[PDB]
Design a protein around this ligand. Structure first.
Ligand SMILES: Nc1ncnc2c1ncn2[C@@H]1O[C@H](COP(=O)(O)O)[C@@H](O)[C@H]1O
Ligand SMILES: Nc1ncnc2c1ncn2[C@@H]1O[C@H](COP(=O)(O)O)[C@@H](O)[C@H]1O
Ligand SMILES: Nc1ncnc2c1ncn2[C@@H]1O[C@H](COP(=O)(O)O)[C@@H](O)[C@H]1O
Ligand SMILES: [Mn+2]
Ligand SMILES: [Mn+2]
Ligand SMILES: [Mn+2]
Ligand SMILES: [Mn+2]
Lengths: 477, 477, 477, 238
């Protein structure tokens, strides 16, 4: 919204930049890259672009459209804090050679089109996303899948399951302070073993332009951690999420650790979710508040929430896209499984943080998502679910500030939950996607590609492989 | 149909029997037991019975019905070939103390009631079952489920995945002959490493009264094996299956091996199924044939087949009752996944073996079942599916002798398959069970108990635990 | 030619036979089996047969022909000397249920049809085959094929490559006598380490009806060995070869060894071949001799030889059917690579043993074949090559008693050799197979099946995998 | 530059505790390593490979050079893909340029004309089939001689395939020529297809005879006489 090309040249110029890392997002959600010498990075890359050698088989920009044009997004230019050779990282939008038309399967293009569509509805001219991604810090991870056996094991020298260890990771003595204490989850050192590592991560984020002003905290619980930062407009909020994951993973890596953002790495500990705060603004002021409406919610907010709860079953195909997502979205660890909004029920898919009569502070929060997917597609899908709700004025059900345990499990069973497996949401998406195709944001092809990838690469592979617990249950049958 | 109490006394008398093993079947399918001295086993046990100390919490004969009466089934009396102290094994029917009424949750009672109901329909007075259960012979099995990891591993010294082993199970040299050859699956020794063990198993079966007359073969393929034997009337065919599994497991056990009847112990090898042949007879002659009908099938047979294919989705809840069942009933190893009958398509749920114009040899075969459950409940459910088809004359679809690959996948997609997960069939049963409750064979309570047990003890436990392959797919997200 | 069903019953009756092993040959050449109780083996099996449960995917008796009928060959009935439970082994011919017509892809049926066709030509009424199969006796074998590496290793405690070993296979001292001596290859003990094992093998062969009358010897050289026995009519000579391999492999197995009949298990030692002697007889007297003809060869013999040399390039597809066959048929170890007949040149594909003026002793010898394939198909293909030569009177080239080294390599280059790779002979067969389809002995389908199997299961798999020597040659490129 | 590049890559890895390989197929189950070569002819200081009237903006100078490449490819590969390992890459998979057709599209085609539009200078052809297992001096020279035999004699190949060869009948897709399958094949194809090489005295018969001798005695025969590990998996039990 403020930075342009020439400024990127000054960042590169002032920093004695040796290399420029060309980044773009693949379908599932991992950033791809190739590097060019800094000397080859000038005005030509911006207006004219760079061709990316027609790669990949199972998807993306084929070969009868052979090459692609990579146009840089100057807002995403950041100095890499890990690479020895001074490098500038920049995200690009993918195009084709016939009419240089933006590739409809580039996740970054879907997010930008979603922002443009917001404008094409007249509702607002800005969608703000403030996602808080949790992660685990481990020391090791190993796994395999063979004909006669399979295993996995994540380990943390100071993990709570290691209280009985004779010696430590380096042969050093077991000094304790591993066991977690019932209930309260954020003890100070030495129970907190990752204080300095989390600080390096936060320092790296702050040096990479992350805004830490309002209620932005650095929190840790055992091996789990979260560093929330200020929101941004849709597309660039998704870019910030990718940058965040990159900084978290590599800070851990350079400090002898290994991080995972998977929804459920531990059976017996908190899952990792991506709690996303949303709101619509216009001309420079809020649109989510009204004291006459519950929790200080405007009629603009209630209907966006209506769309989220109505389309949730299919929305989850982009919001909780993995098989592992459903080990978190299962009975436990108050993971947003209930399809109701409220300032109270945090186990509710949507939570309106207590912000009173302040129109600007008023925001909704879809707590159900996780960080196992594509933030560009997830945020875009969330907007499309909400826009289908505001325009068509979709009315959901009453907010539940009254907790669902003290209540009859008849009216608590009538409280909808989301599907139980990835195969379910992929089916719910296969049938609930008109809101997605509106304004040409998501194409049928893109949705068909996502469904294909998930079934062939995730659902079926896990499904054909016997689970270790099946041996505990059935070897003796 | 021929043996009575006094004969059981002579078997025990002639064999210098020291102990009598009192056996009964639990809900999921494993035989339970307690032993009494042979001297305490007389006419009193038969007409009066034995009380079984009010046990078990999660099910069966509670405590305000406190005790049970165990009446012996003289047809099931067999000398145990494994127990050092000479023992006679006998199966019992479970009862209660108020009116000594047969407990409606005893699997053996469900099977006997099914035989009585066959008679109460007038259709026939005998249901013959000839099931062929496959199994794997291993050398070891280990597995666990922890907070930070999980694994399983089955091993066979001469398993095909061990071609590269430096030495063997006992430090002895790797002598080869492990690799399996593409296509053909029954090579002679030394590729066949279990010749003598299978012979001990067959010798033990023959000594335990198993009839090996017609096309009954002893076959082995790698570590997998099958020893089919002559059919029997429903209840006692289920008793024979339990006896068979007992003899197979313990012959392996006494010979330094470990057997498993689980549907899919190996990812990359044939699954283990329970191919069940069925037929209805009356007064002493067949009822399944007619040359005018396809494959020499009478109109009595076609409708039984109609019921099987119609009720299959729910029938599988008793026929393929485990989570592991669905690793076999998945795309591959021509496991009966297609809901059509035929003399040809073996990947079809039902196969009518080529028996020509012989009314007696004419029989249908439900190849979809596996040995992971309860044979009493599985056979009974199969009969009830077929009886709902004969009486109400349920017409299915045309037999497919023409293989489904060479054909358009439109008409091949219209070819129904069974549900994909255990949770699906449990849902299909929850709604498709009227045929089961007919004649009071299966009670709503029994069906409700089965559904509860499966959801709480199998479906949910596996579902909440991360699969090892999820780490391969998502640790790096 | 002499034994019938009733005699088989007496063999089984006199020997207290517990089991009967039903054997049949698969496409590539390995015997398959299933066992039935001896009590189920009576007159019914002979005239009526046994159905073999419609198995195998990649070939053989499909499923719209679902079942097969197994008719026993009483000439092949032998008592198994290895199986603990007294067993009778018998080979069967494969059939179908529509008109019980012999399956045209059963190797044993191809051999029997070849014998019948010999009669349908009027040329003779008997084809005699006397093949001598060599093999290696090892102590161990291990190998694998992975993404980043591959290996294989055969070992023999007393192998000539182990002269430097500090201790032996069992930790015992290295007692020497391993090194082979230049030239002469059959030293007495202790250089000969397998004297007693070879004797057990010969004793087992003799007890299994193998005729050891004429120049039948038991010979050993290092770990290699050969026990030649008396010839037999085509089909049953192929049955004897299967029995021989079975007895050799299992005698080794029960005595802590492992045998291989592969053409070239060792790089630096003699390959293993199957030198096959042939001849045509009629009414009870010979047809291969004439003093007027070279080496005492009749005009009947010269033309059979003409067919062998003419059709050799394609004949080798059944005669030397593996990729490993071509490590033997390469420059070295005088393996019959030259397409000329002679009493002299043993490196010639055909060798007429010195038998002088004796019409009966006169026989031709195709020394090129190995034991890596199917003897039924190999012998049949040899007959068809020879019959195409006798009938059409195919004239080859002059016999070479004069060795091909002392001679100009111009006239020695004009001396044809056989193709260099399996892919070559499979191509030569794809085009040179009319002699095979004559009289309906080999069907186009059978030949097409063989070509498919070889390309997909052998040629391509080996071809796509980098050879270890490529790393020695090219890692540094 | 190619020799210098390999030297710098290998030794940078070496001084940093690693070991590099340029062999065509070091891994069974991962991408092979190829040497995608872009070519073009220039005169006096300006391009000669472009023309909008011609397909992909190709001049008649370019089409015939491409004609020579596709015509002589079977023998050209003896210098362009000179090792036994070269044929583990040039096998069905990892879109290795196995098809003898040029195109801006089919990358599995031996020749690919990168999208460069109407810019005469940017117009270049790309022989993607080669690998780095041989001699770059001989490989580049052989490529030029294949192309020069095409421009002078005006050798016309076949139509460019921007339409991918999977969606199409495997009859017209089988008529689409591929290169030989083994090193022994290309060495034979060179033994007979080398006049373009001897033109102008660039490659001598002796040099070609030396190459053929070296390959047969030092590479083809040595690998051929040695049993492959997979043969034990397939045949130990025969
Ligand atoms: N319109 C908005 N106004 C203010 N904050 C927002 C808006 N849209 C999204 N947010 C994000 O709400 C997130 C934090 O939640 P919490 O765990 O309650 O501290 C932050 O990441 C915010 O910056
Ligand atoms: N009514 C019946 N008549 C004859 N055999 C039957 C009947 N009902 C069930 N069977 C069983 O069919 C089974 C065998 O199948 P297969 O794998 O084709 O040899 C055996 O276990 C038979 O004994
Ligand atoms: N017609 C025949 N007359 C005599 N021996 C034969 C005939 N056809 C094949 N043979 C076989 O020739 C083989 C032996 O060869 P050798 O290594 O020279 O001792 C033996 O296995 C013979 O029994
Ligand atoms: Mn939150
Ligand atoms: Mn069956
Ligand atoms: Mn010989
Ligand atoms: Mn390229």
């Amino acid at each position: 919204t403020e930075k342009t090309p020439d400024d990127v040249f000054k960042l590169a110029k002032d920093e004695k930049v040796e290399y420029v890392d060309v980044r773009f997002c693949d379908l599932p959600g991992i950033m791809q890259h190739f590097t060019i010498p800094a000397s080859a990075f000038d005005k030509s890359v911006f207006d004219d672009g760079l061709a990316f050698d027609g790669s990949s088989i199972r998807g993306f920009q084929s070969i009868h459209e052979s090459d692609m044009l990579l146009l840089p997004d100057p807002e995403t230019a950041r100095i890499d804090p890990f690479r020895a050779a001074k490098t500038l990282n920049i995200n690009f939008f993918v195009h084709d050679p016939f009419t240089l038309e933006p590739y409809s399967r580039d996740p970054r293009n879907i997010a930008r089109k979603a922002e443009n569509y917001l404008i094409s509805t007249g509702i607002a001219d800005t969608a703000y996303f403030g996602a808080e991604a949790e992660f685990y810090i481990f020391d090791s991870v190993s796994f395999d899948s063979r004909a006669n056996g399979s295993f996995y094991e994540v380990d943390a020298i100071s993990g709570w399951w290691n209280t009985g260890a004779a010696t430590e990771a380096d042969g050093s003595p077991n000094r304790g302070y591993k066991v977690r204490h019932k209930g309260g989850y954020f003890p100070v050192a030495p129970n907190d073993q990752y204080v300095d590592l989390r600080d390096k991560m936060l320092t790296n984020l702050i040096n990479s332009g992350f805004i830490l002003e309002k209620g932005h905290h650095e929190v840790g619980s055992g091996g789990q951690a979260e560093i929330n930062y200020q929101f941004n407009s849709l597309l660039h909020a998704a870019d910030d999420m990718q940058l965040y994951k990159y900084i978290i993973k590599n800070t851990a890596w350079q400090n002898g650790k290994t991080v995972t953002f998977m929804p459920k790495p531990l059976f017996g500990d908190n899952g990792s979710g991506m709690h996303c705060h949303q709101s619509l603004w216009k001309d420079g002021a809020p649109l989510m508040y009204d004291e006459t409406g519950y929790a200080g919610l405007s009629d603009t907010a209630r209907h966006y929430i209506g769309g989220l709860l109505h389309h949730a079953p299919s929305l989850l195909a982009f919001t909780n896209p993995t098989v592992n997502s459903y080990k978190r979205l299962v009975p436990g660890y108050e993971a947003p499984i209930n399809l109701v909004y409220s300032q109270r029920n945090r186990s509710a898919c949507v939570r309106i943080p207590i912000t009173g009569s302040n129109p600007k502070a008023k925001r909704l929060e879809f707590r159900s998502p996780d960080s196992s997917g594509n933030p560009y597609l997830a945020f875009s899908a969330m907007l499309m679910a909400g826009l289908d709700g505001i325009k068509n004025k979709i009315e959901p059900q009453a907010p539940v500030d009254k907790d669902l345990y003290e209540l009859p499990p008849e009216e608590a069973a009538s409280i909808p939950q989301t599907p139980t497996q990835l195969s379910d949401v992929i089916d719910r998406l296969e049938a609930d996607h008109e809101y997605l195709t509106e304004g040409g944001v998501f194409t049928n092809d893109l949705i068909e590609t996502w469904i294909s990838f998930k079934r062939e690469n995730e659902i079926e592979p896990v499904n054909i492989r016997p689970h270790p617990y099946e041996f505990a249950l059935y070897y003796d049958v």
